[PDB]
Paper text:
The essential and metabolic enzyme [name] (AK) undergoes large-scale conformational changes in response to binding of its substrates ATP and AMP. In addition to the well-characterized ATP- and AMP-binding domains (ATPlid and AMPbd, respectively), the enzyme has three functional loop segments including the p-loop, the selectivity loop, and the catalytic loop. Here, based on a comparative structure–function analysis of AK enzymes from [name] and the archaea Odinarchaeota and from human AK1, we found that conformational changes in the enzymes are to a varying degree linked to bending, fraying, or unfolding/folding events of the termini of α-helices observed in various structural hot spots of the enzymes.
Changes in the E114-helix (residues Asp113–Gly122) located in the ATPlid are linked to changes in the interaction pattern for residue Glu114. In the open state, this residue forms a salt bridge to the side chain of Arg165 positioned on a separate helix. Following closure of the ATPlid and AMPbd, the salt bridge is broken, and the side chain of Glu114 changes rotamer, enabling the formation of a hydrogen bond to its backbone amide proton. The structure of the AKeco Glu114Ala variant in complex with the inhibitor [name] was determined to 1.6 Å resolution with X-ray crystallography. In the Glu114Ala variant, the ATPlid and AMPbd subdomains are, as expected, positioned in a closed conformation, identical to the [name]-bound native AKeco structure. The observed salt bridge between Glu114 and Arg165 present in the open state of the AKeco structure is disrupted in the Glu114Ala variant, and there are no significant structural effects on the overall structure due to the Glu to Ala substitution in the closed state. However, a close-up view of the N-terminus of the E114-helix in the closed state revealed two bound water molecules that seem to compensate for the missing carboxyl group of the Ala114 side chain. As such, the Glu114Ala variant is expected to shift its conformational equilibrium toward a closed state. This hypothesis was strengthened by the determined catalytic activity, where K M of the AKeco Glu114Ala variant is reduced approximately 3-fold compared to wild-type AKeco. Taken together, the data agree with the Glu114-Arg165 salt bridge being important for the inherent local structural stabilization of the open conformation of the ATPlid in AKeco.
Author numbering: 1 to 214
């Protein structure tokens, strides 16, 4: 099973990724998680993203494409994977097709622009695992702590109001066109496309995705 999650920043993609991963027993390929990890570890492949992410801009297609190629070549992706934040531009989507990476489902998470800053100001993360929380809308079971490891949650450095605004501009400029791109792929019978209302509570979005996936 191969799935792409599409949506504006803060739409809920990473939150629902956890539930899809357990359903199909497939790993999550999160380019945001991988770029942040490369910066933290100083890995030659990806540390370049530090200044770009801080400015709210997109990392070069060339750099992310190489990160994903390396990741999906490993044994745990042999029987499927979940793409979460990739592709983010048309050239990234074209690179997947040129490389013969078809997918079974493309799932669009729709959230109005006006809700996005509130979602990100309350976002707290557990960087080692990628788990995501929200202090109001989806809080940890213990305040400030990861549910699984008990480690103190952090706030992403790019989760500031002004940076999220810039991310939203970049999304509409370069990423939103992927909705039409993959809608046409579905019209041609190359994948399945579905849109969900991301303003519903987390558990209701999860149930809506269950009905689409079966
Ligand atoms: N492919 C690529 N090409 C180029 N550059 C790339 C790239 N990939 C990454 N980058 C770089 O990395 C930077 C950051 O990218 P990225 O890591 O993708 O961050 P982002 O743009 O801010 O959006 P996310 O995908 O992290 O949010 P989400 O849709 O998963 O929602 P979430 O579950 O967290 O939920 C949001 C919040 O709301 C809460 N919430 C979730 N669901 C609900 C709900 N249903 N109701 C209420 N609250 C909810 C959550 O708890 C959370 O707190 C980019 O600017 C770029 O520089």
């Amino acid at each position: 099973m191969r799935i792409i999650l599409l949506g504006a920043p803060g739409a809920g993609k990473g939150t629902q990724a956890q539930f899809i991963m357990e359903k199909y027993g497939i790993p999550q390929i999160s380019t945001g998680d991988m770029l942040r990890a490369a910066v933290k570890s100083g890995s030659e492949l990806g540390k370049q993203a530090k200044d770009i992410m801080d400015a709210g801009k997109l990392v070069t297609d060339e750099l992310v494409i190489a990160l994903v190629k390396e990741r999906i070549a490993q044994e745990d992706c042999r029987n499927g994977f979940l793409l979460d934040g990739f592709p983010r531009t048309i050239p990234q989507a074209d690179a997947m097709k040129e490389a013969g990476i078809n997918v079974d489902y493309v799932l669009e998470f729709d959230v109005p622009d006006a809700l996005i800053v509130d979602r990100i100001v309350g976002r707290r993360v557990h960087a080692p695992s990628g788990r995501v929380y929200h202090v109001k809308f989806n809080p940890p079971k213990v305040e400030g702590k990861d549910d699984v490891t008990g480690e103190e949650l952090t706030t992403r450095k790019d989760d500031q109001e002004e940076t999220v605004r810039k991310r939203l501009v970049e999304y509409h400029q370069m990423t939103a066109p992927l909705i039409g791109y993959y809608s046409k792929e579905a019209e041609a019978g190359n994948t399945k496309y579905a849109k969900v209302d991301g303003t519903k509570p987390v558990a209701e979005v999860r149930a809506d995705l269950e009905k689409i996936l079966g």
